[PDB]
């Protein structure tokens, strides 16, 4: 009890939509608390990647961080299904997965076993593919050195389109594209702009392969140290900032194509059914690994 300063880490850098929302959240919090709740920000992955920061929340060394609902598959394997390529069709579908009994089951397991209290989840965009050569069809993916994050389902998307996946951390991506150490990367409409991957990538392939949410997670042990009113402020505010964040991404995702082409970017609309070819065996193994079918259930929500 007293003045409280919460520690928030993120991989996103200053000038990102994720950071602007966290700064707005920082902006909202000590305003509504009359200075008693403060939020310190640690962007650009200076504390580690999202997996490392989640581990710090579990151990009580960091208070708040971003994570996708499917990224919980690192801890709760069935949760990765929401991130399987093309299974989640849009954000509204993902939120329905996030709020179903299956979602609440994962969220409960996050809280009991890993000290993660998900306060809300926001839209962070649908991932598209950029490259140094044009990607008109899935057949053009063969032999492409495609950068992916250290995430199984981003790799799977790359593997099954026929590309050569190269997993590496988000901070190294721009330069590896500049040096053509990798031929391409895959990320959302706002991230390619904010991170300025388009400066070093002449092609963009509307592949729509993964829909990213963005959970705001607080350490449960820190949450339980708060007063009921402080919790209400934080709850009110995160939900406050999420509506803006989700809307901001939707606005940007609608306009940024007009922007990229005006920056001489070649944008291709490949036929996606052959990409949907390919995840079919991946879905079947996923259900099999887990001991219980889930992929078909999730896709139908």
């Amino acid at each position, epitope marked *: 009890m007293g003045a409280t300063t919460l520690k928030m880490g993120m991989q996103a850098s200053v000038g990102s939509v994720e950071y602007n929302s966290a700064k707005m959240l920082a902006d909202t919090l000590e305003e509504m608390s009359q200075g008693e709740i403060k939020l310190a920000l640690y962007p650009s992955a200076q504390l580690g990647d999202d997996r490392a920061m989640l*581990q710090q929340l*579990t*151990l009580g060394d960091l208070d708040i961080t971003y994570a996708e609902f499917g990224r919980m598959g*690192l801890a709760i*394997p069935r949760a990765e299904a929401v991130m399987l390529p093309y299974v989640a069709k849009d954000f509204d579908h993902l939120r329905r997965m996030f709020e179903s009994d299956f979602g609440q089951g994962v969220r409960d397991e996050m809280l009991q*076993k890993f*000290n993660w209290r998900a306060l809300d989840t926001w839209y962070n965009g649908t991932r598209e593919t950029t490259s140094n050569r044009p990607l008109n069809s899935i057949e053009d993916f063969k032999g492409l050195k495609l950068r992916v994050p250290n995430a199984k389902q981003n790799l799977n998307y790359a593997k099954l389109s026929g590309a050569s996946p190269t997993p590496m951390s988000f901070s190294e991506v721009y330069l590896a594209l500049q040096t053509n150490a990798v031929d391409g990367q895959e990320n959302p409409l706002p991230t390619i702009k904010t991170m300025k991957f388009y400066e070093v990538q002449k092609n963009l392939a509307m592949t729509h392969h993964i829909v990213n949410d963005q959970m705001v997670i607080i350490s449960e042990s820190t949450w339980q140290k708060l007063s009921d009113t402080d919790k209400d402020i934080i709850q009110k505010a995160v939900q406050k900032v999420g509506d803006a964040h989700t809307q901001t991404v939707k606005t940007q995702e609608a306009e940024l194509v007009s922007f990229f082409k005006s920056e001489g970017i070649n944008v291709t609309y490949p036929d996606l059914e052959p990409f949907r070819e390919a995840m079919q065996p991946l879905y079947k193994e996923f259900d099999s*690994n887990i001991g219980q079918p889930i992929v078909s259930k999730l896709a139908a929500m």
Partner: nanobody
Amino acid sequence: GSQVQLVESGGRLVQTGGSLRLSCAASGDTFSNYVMGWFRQAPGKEREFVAAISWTGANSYYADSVAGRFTISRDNAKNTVALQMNSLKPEDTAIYYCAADHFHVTHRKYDYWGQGTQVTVSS
């Protein structure tokens, strides 16, 4: 197949000041998905955390009782975790347990556990 099976080896009678390497073999689910930990138990007590190592080996955690003396390491090709014990003292006599979990945790016990391996340190 989601569960992990663990088998420790290395337990011996050793001398004060001696060094001993424990090894643990993991099977079942994908080894690199798990933080690997070492715990030890004397009768009556609960278990002491000894050491833990992250998925890639980049992060490792140690108890103050063994920090500087013990070293934990893993091999994701052999699916093994090892605990190198140096400067062993009698307080360290215990059954040492290999454990696996998706994340390092302190508010609860790890999900998966080995049969236990006995370490005896003589004065």
